[PDB]
Design a protein around this ligand. Structure first.
Ligand code: ANP
Ligand code: ANP
Ligand code: MG
Ligand code: MG
Lengths: 387, 387
């Protein structure tokens, strides 16, 4: 093999298709137990087989819609549609659209720049301490690259125009955008057909649809002041506590006693629920409406407070050694938080790495909350083990 | 704020400095309990404060050296030097050097291409089923970008020349390489001064040095057939079992009984040790000499086999329900494995996501190993809990 065959340089676009994993996660199937929202049973935990990268390209567009609530606090609604037969997914939001105007430096329409060129973002100036989920300038282009058809429609009264442009064939083909006069209520709608061949799939099957549906429920629970519709029907979740109820309101512990679920909205940026776990530590958490399914420093920040206080309570009835991991083993925690300029080790944003001193706010749980935590069965499980 | 201030495009090089986290991990301090190799006590677990991105740029160069054992199986030695006073780190390896010749497509010397331009690699052709750690074509450039001085020296008898080139100021300045006749024993040596200002550090302190030193011990344990020297002295680790001994050979369980450590080299590509944990599930694992500190499917693949067999043993003395997470809670596992074309969700490569069917080999632990596992205190811990 020649020097030129061995030592190769790739373009950014080539690298995404060759090495999709650090951009969207695995493009091969994964089977694991997890929470989904099924047509027959609603929220449930079961074995699911799905391709992470396909789930992620949907997530990128969904979080972008949630992020618009930061650009326009008057936004009220996100509508999600999934049609497996046609292979069409659409995510629509109201509030301010995207300026339909030529960017004077890049010499293209703003929506064409930020959906059709890599490393483009309104989130690159960190002197603004934003609580958007978007950080890197990739997500929407990644969905485009992994779609056979990707359409951006946006309407922005301030700039008096609407914009519609369609890309095809993994962002490699497009045509002139349709620009029209507009003076109505702003919106953005992203409609895409995922390139299932990139994920070795024949169709959007029940498992991936159940995961994408649950993500819409997550959004209804995490994005304050935004109602969510799925396939034309409003989701009956009106805040984080009602979302948490989907997991624990109808559940018993192993002794047949209903789970005691405690809750505190510490402040606008920190909403916490907690109950007993009997299958090891569990956490369901959101940072800026991103599902941080591998946790991060926000989870540790909340959990460490609870663990410290519960160790205190146990000690007052111990008289041998109760270690923090043993307490954490009995905790099921739910967190919805807003973090300024969060960091993650991956574009997938499953683990949030920013240290608490940089969050821009604190979550100092009240003594009332800690007392309630001492009554939800965790202490009893530990003390029974101190025998 | 104007459209041009709000909506911004970044170059690849700008994006690395603006968003370092998905390239090298966090550039802010982190404090946590972990294993390091200290000058006073050797291998020990203690609270450490360090900057992940600094540790990672060192790791990138170290794994590149290990990877040369795949290019040249005759390689025998890696030498690591760290001088905190001068702020100079060097990593040297023998075996084949890098061709000192002009790349006919890129029109630069091969070493200048692959250390000085992004997205350059000999690991981009996956039809070769390689067990190198390198996959993405970033690591060496990331170290260069995060160094105030970065020197590449390589000597390649086949091409009859040696090469030395120095970059400065975060890869933004360089000068003509020194090319000389060479007909000796090949080597490559990477010498760099990390840009401590990028990590808000004044010096390479004891904690970061102890982490980097432990990584050299990891390499002595994981890279078959390669001896490792640190600051001029050979590390007395001659294989994976002797490496594992640094953690467990002198340890007792909480009842005062020595840990029973079991071992099986299932085949050339899978080396496994296992013992009892009393602080929850623990894993120390390597994929292609990468420290997979967040685990991955290789860990799950090994652990699930052990858990399944130990549940069998417990059941034969149970007569209530023993759940897999409870068994895993008592396992400390050590894995050194070689995986073809591994995948990870991050450039940092802490979690290996490739499914076992794609590994290119299997690890089917023997019935002898499972019997030994049933005698290392895990079953006893579980059974005592079934009371
Ligand atoms: N629904 C939307 N409404 C308004 N603006 C949007 C919407 N979706 C995307 N944008 C804009 O398009 C830009 C590019 O989106 P995207 O590629 O996802 O990058 P990002 O969200 O800034 N960062 P990341 O998602 O971390 O890669 C965003 O920064 C927004 O300015
Ligand atoms: N010590 C070394 N000896 C020989 N070749 C080397 C050495 N270090 C680096 N290289 C070469 O330089 C290339 C670029 O290194 P690097 O930037 O780390 O990319 P990579 O190792 O291929 N992938 P990654 O580390 O996953 O980003 C490698 O692919 C090798 O061909
Ligand atoms: Mg985004
Ligand atoms: Mg490398």
């Amino acid at each position: 093999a020649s020097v030129e065959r061995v030592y190769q340089k790739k373009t950014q676009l080539e690298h995404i298709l060759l090495r999709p994993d650090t951009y969207i996660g695995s493009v091969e199937p994964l089977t694991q137990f997890m929470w989904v929202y099924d047509e027959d049973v609603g929220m449930n935990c079961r074995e699911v087989t799905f391709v992470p990268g396909l789930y992620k390209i949907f997530d990128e567009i969904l979080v972008n819609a949630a992020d618009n609530k930061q650009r326009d606090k008057n936004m009220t609604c996100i509508k999600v549609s999934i049609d497996p037969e046609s292979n069409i997914i659409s995510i629509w939001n109201n509030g301010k659209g995207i300026p339909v105007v030529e960017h004077k430096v890049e010499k293209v329409y703003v929506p064409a720049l930020i959906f059709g060129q890599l490393l483009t973002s309104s989130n690159y100036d960190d002197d603004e301490k934003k609580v958007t989920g978007g950080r890197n300038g990739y997500g929407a282009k990644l969905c485009n690259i992994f779609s056979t058809k990707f359409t951006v429609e946006t309407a922005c009264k301030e700039y008096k125009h609407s914009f519609k442009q369609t890309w095809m064939n993994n962002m490699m083909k497009t045509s002139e955008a349709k620009i029209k006069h507009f003076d109505g209520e702003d919106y953005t709608c992203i409609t895409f057909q995922p390139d299932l061949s990139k994920f070795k799939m024949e169709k959007l099957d029940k498992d991936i649809v159940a995961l994408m549906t649950r993500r819409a429920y997550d959004l209804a629970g995490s994005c304050r002041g935004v109602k969510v519709m799925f396939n034309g029907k409003k989701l009956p979740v009106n805040g984080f506590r009602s979302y948490v109820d989907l997991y624990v309101k109808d559940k018993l512990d192993e002794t047949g006693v209903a789970l005691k679920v405690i809750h505190e909205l510490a402040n606008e940026r920190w909403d916490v629920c907690l109950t007993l776990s009997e299958k090891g530590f569990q956490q369901i958490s959101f940072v800026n409406s991103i599902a941080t399914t591998k946790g991060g420093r926000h989870v540790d920040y909340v959990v460490d407070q609870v663990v410290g206080k519960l160790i205190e309570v146990v000690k007052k009835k111990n008289k041998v050694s109760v270690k923090p991991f043993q307490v954490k083993n009995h905790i099921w925690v739910f967190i919805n938080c807003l973090i300024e300029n969060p960091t993650f080790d991956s574009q997938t944003k499953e683990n949030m790495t920013l240290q608490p001193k940089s969050f821009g706010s604190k979550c100092q749980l009240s003594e009332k909350f800690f007392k309630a935590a001492s009554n939800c069965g965790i202490v009893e499980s530990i003390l029974n083990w101190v025998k």
